[PDB]
Design a protein around this nucleic acid. Structure first.
Lengths: 92, 82, 92, 72, 93, 92, 77, 77
DNA sequence: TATCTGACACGTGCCTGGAGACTAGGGAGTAATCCCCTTGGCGGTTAAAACGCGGGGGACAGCGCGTACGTGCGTTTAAGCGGTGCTAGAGCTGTCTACGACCAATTGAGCGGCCTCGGCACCGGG
DNA sequence: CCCGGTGCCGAGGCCGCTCAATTGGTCGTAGACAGCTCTAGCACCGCTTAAACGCACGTACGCGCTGTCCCCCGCGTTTTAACCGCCAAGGGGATTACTCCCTAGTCTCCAGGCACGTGTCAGATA
């Protein structure tokens, strides 16, 4: 029993490229990339929450962490995608 | 109001003094524009990060702590404004 | 699940569990795991899309670490994010 | 080493392009000024080293480009 | 002794360091001796840097330690400089 | 009321140099330095406890954080000073 | 010891770097810098291993050491 | 254009193990640990050689000499 | 030579945060078992390292020139400083309410073992 | 420098078990919001003067040009040790079960450290 993002990465890959496989070493690299990015965004949002004396990590801390950690167009599209997902989730 | 062309307010003697403190003896005439551009890029990045911090805090004033955090995120820790 | 409610392919339950057990804040909102999962999915999809495109430009039907580093280093935003990152089997 | 009023004016000019509405505490301006001074002084130290590596004494923009490129 | 800072014979507060390690989101559990160890380490580092700064200020026939003396004490030392190699000492010359 | 490390830094100064003062700007610098070192050691200890699946921060995580963050003789003396303080605390 | 990092290996590393011509005094410098880099990384990894009270240095110890020096490495954990 | 490893596996394992015996005498290394160390060392050396070539080109030369490696190490720090 | 003038530096009030004392509950310590992964040693082949020679390409020095940099000096601009003055705006505080933690029951997503075939390295004729 | 024949091991999919995630509900407390007061950032004025600018001039030196030579790359031949494959042994990592003592939590108490106010040592003033 070990947690990993392999199945979700495979679903994303077979979405964008239904006919393209992926090597196991590429899965390991992508699994490290996902863990790294999650940890960086989470830590930056934790600092954002602490600096304002807040105790809760809301969606606004994660949005600010994304806006600080990723370059311009990447940050713009990531913010749009995250807002879309949050709106679709809370609209149900 | 709006502001224009203040990067040319970093006169030739100021850049020369910064160089003398750095240890430069002779300064080519094309150095000044290069240093003005470099300083502009650095300040643009730092002010962008500080403005993001201020905007999240739901304020209108950039404080010294916001600039200190912006510098720290860039890896340029500053002492003396706690 | 909450992924289907948000319409994602990345887990929101696991991301919530990780934001909670990761000692990032005293409490975590219900919109932070969703936003973070959406951002992680978008970045993974971007990397996979570019790597598969690089593999197509190399007549290969598998994403391997060389394709990942071609996708990363040949993108200025995407390489500013991962400049301090080396990749096994990635090459130059 | 840099006059305070021109530096503050430059900071406000740069900041107007990110939010139109801002004002800056004097301590924020001081922190920015000291950070910029230190950054430029370090840049000039690395530029001088590159120039001496060339066998020149005069620093040229290529020296600054190398000092910024290698430093990453 | 009533004060934990005196029971360990330190000058930095062990209670404040315990509270900071409890309210800082570092773990859900903080040991008893961890604040003592951290306070002792912080006190040693502060004492060392203050000693070097005062020695520098006495080498210039000055009485007070100003930021310039702190910068001199940091940069003129190898290990201390290696600890603070990306730190800008304001008004430190 | 806003806390700081002014009193304790002044007391340490009065031990090391009984007859010298410290300017207020240098006092702010010393306070910032103390905060920075505290944050560095605490973050390293937290990651050390997270890696080993541990829930608590003992003196052994703090000692290892000191051992990693500080150069050779500085780390050697910091460890000795921490060990002495812990022994004096537990002995009474 | 360090002399197992032969001259052809340093030439192959330099030619992948793009170096066209190599002086004869480069190889000793390269061996020295490799020794220093390995010394730092291995010391951090050994500290990490001994904190866990283990006796084998794992790939994750080296990954954490590198990330402490700022050399984040993907593909091993 | 390639993506393989440039130093030999056994000399590098011997060098890493010999360095480690100074820091703690009794350790085992995992096979993945040596792989990670070798990958990181190769990447670091390749980057250093790229900066060295840039320094050499700046100095109006074509060959790289040690003074290029000290300059690159000093700037990168 | 009186005096007066700020940044250090010390004298009170107090309130709030740290300490003394005790429970209760689980994180962690430790004995015991299993086996996975490390260590070491040996043999073949063959690819790579090592040595050795020749030249020409590039490094290094000297010289010569003309260009652009430092220094000086008089002028011109605007920073710095005091003073006024206001108003956005950060911080403190008083409520109350909605949102997150906990806990009980249930289940289905995901992980491990396993199995079959396709994507990619080889080749020797095309 | 392409092409069909052979070929192989990990990638993708399948199946069953399990514990982590979802569902409904209550408790509690963090923060969103409205109000208010005091600060400090920003705009404008008059005056002083220090820094910045504009030209002139010598000259320090950066760039090119040629020459000298040395030592690095190509290449060929010899040596060696890296690597794949096997085998034998063990030891230390990973897990499981039993206990205990160490820390969160609570309550009462009290002292210490933070504010405000005033005294005081280098230094120039009337």
């Amino acid at each position: 029993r070990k947690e990993s993002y392999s199945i979700y990465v495979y679903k994303v890959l077979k979405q964008v490229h239904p006919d393209t496989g992926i090597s196991s070493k590429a899965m390991g690299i992508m699994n490290s990339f996902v863990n790294d990015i999650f940890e960086r965004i989470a830590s930056e949002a934790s600092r954002l929450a602490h600096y304002n004396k807040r105790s809760t990590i809301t969606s606004r801390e994660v949005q600010t962490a994304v806006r600080l950690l990723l370059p311009g167009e990447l940050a713009k599209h990531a913010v749009s995608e995250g807002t879309k997902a949050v709106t679709k989730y809370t609209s149900s | 109001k709006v502001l224009r062309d203040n990067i040319q307010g970093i006169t030739k003697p100021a850049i020369r003094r910064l160089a003398r403190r750095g240890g430069v003896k002779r300064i080519s005439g094309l150095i000044y524009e290069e240093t003005r551009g470099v300083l502009k890029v650095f300040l643009e990045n730092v002010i962008r990060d500080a403005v993001t911090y201020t905007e999240h805090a739901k304020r209108k004033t950039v404080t010294a702590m916001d600039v200190v955090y912006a510098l720290k995120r860039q890896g340029r820790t500053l002492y003396g404004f706690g | 699940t909450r992924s289907s409610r948000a319409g994602l392919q990345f887990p929101v339950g696991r991301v919530h569990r990780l934001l909670r057990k990761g000692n990032y804040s005293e409490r975590v909102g219900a919109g932070a795991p969703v936003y973070l999962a959406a951002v992680l999915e978008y970045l993974t999809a971007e990397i996979l899309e570019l790597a598969g495109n690089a593999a197509r430009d190399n007549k290969k039907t598998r994403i391997i670490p060389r394709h990942l580093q071609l996708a990363i280093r040949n993108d200025e935003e995407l390489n500013k994010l991962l400049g301090r990152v080396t990749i096994a089997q990635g090459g130059v | 080493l840099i006059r305070k009023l021109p530096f503050q004016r430059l900071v406000l000019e740069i900041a107007q392009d990110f939010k139109t509405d801002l004002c800056f505490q004097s301590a924020a301006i001081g922190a920015l000024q000291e950070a910029s001074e230190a950054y430029l002084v370090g840049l000039f130290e690395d530029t001088n080293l590159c120039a001496i590596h060339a066998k020149r004494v005069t620093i040229m923009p290529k020296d600054t480009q190398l000092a910024g490129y290698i430093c990453r």
